[PDB]
Design a protein around this ligand. Structure first.
Ligand code: BVI
Length: 262
């Protein structure tokens, strides 16, 4: 069919130091996708991880064209935008909606950890929503391999977003990849349930993190979170990453399994 190769760029979806993301619409079919446009070794690594992804809760990669030294990355479009924009400041969202998002988050993180990929920047800006509000883990530009040939490799690179980062990345030289992504999913949950972030970073100098370590859940944001999800957060936001709840045990948590949503 002539012209099915052609896509019109119709809306800006995001701009950063990386380049931009454009909503693209096929000239013939009207299929809508997201095109990440960049102006070397890093994009090479990113494309390689992007090709490994095939799950309903992770953004799908359709392939890439280079024109000149400009790379175009075609991927699944999520027409409902980011989870960030469903969170009402100081309120959060309804507990059933939050639980449903957290289920989908866990499904995508399980998936990634299964294929030996860590995301390293899980936050509501990187969690996108399709036309039916299904959650898609986006942005693989910090993702890396933590398991290959069934052997684990420890991480040392400091990266992510401070209010989301686990405390071991601030205190230890090396750390396991999986407890880091689990912690950031906890902060996601807190945000959905409270419409606020609990601390600037999880350090001994941050009074809001000390308050948590001392159990002062009569303070915000914790006082806004019902006892059942707050139990779960007590098991996720544990400072020692070796004692921190794993995903298989999150799937056994009372709140996680509570029926809430129609
Ligand atoms: C359709 C839509 C999306 N999708 C959307 N879909 C897929 C994406 C894949 C990679 C990167 C991004 C963007 C950086 C976030 C993506 N983004 C994002 N934002 N949006 C609207 C923009 C205007 O405001 C309403 C929401």
């Amino acid at each position: 069919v002539p012209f099915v190769e052609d896509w019109d760029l119709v809306q800006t979806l995001g701009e950063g130091a990386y380049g931009e993301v454009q909503l693209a619409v096929n000239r013939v079919t009207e299929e809508a996708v997201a095109v990440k446009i960049v102006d070397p070794e890093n994009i090479k690594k990113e494309i390689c991880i992007l090709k490994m992804l095939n799950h309903e809760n992770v953004i799908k990669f359709y392939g890439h064209r280079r024109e000149g030294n400009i790379q175009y990355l075609f991927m699944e479009l999520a027409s409902g935008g980011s989870l960030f924009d469903r969170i009402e400041p100081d309120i959060g969202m309804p507990e059933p909606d939050a639980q449903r998002f957290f289920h989908q988050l866990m499904a995508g993180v399980v998936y990634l950890h299964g294929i030996g990929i860590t995301h390293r920047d899980i936050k509501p800006h990187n969690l996108l929503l399709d036309e039916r509000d299904n959650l898609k883990i986006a942005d693989y530009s910090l993702a890396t391999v933590f398991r290959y040939n069934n052997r684990e490799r420890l991480l040392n690179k400091m990266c992510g977003t401070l209010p989301y980062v686990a405390p071991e990345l601030l205190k230890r030289r090396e750390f396991h990849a999986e407890p880091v992504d689990v912690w950031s999913c906890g902060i996601v949950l807190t945000a959905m349930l409270a419409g606020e972030l609990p601390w600037d970073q999880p350090s001994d100098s941050c009074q809001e993190y000390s308050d948590w370590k001392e159990k002062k859940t009569y303070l915000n944001p914790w006082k806004k979170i019902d006892s059942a999800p707050l139990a779960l957060l007590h098991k996720i936001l544990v400072e020692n990453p070796s004692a921190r709840i794993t995903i298989p045990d999150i799937k056994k948590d009372r709140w996680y399994n509570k029926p809430l949503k129609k």
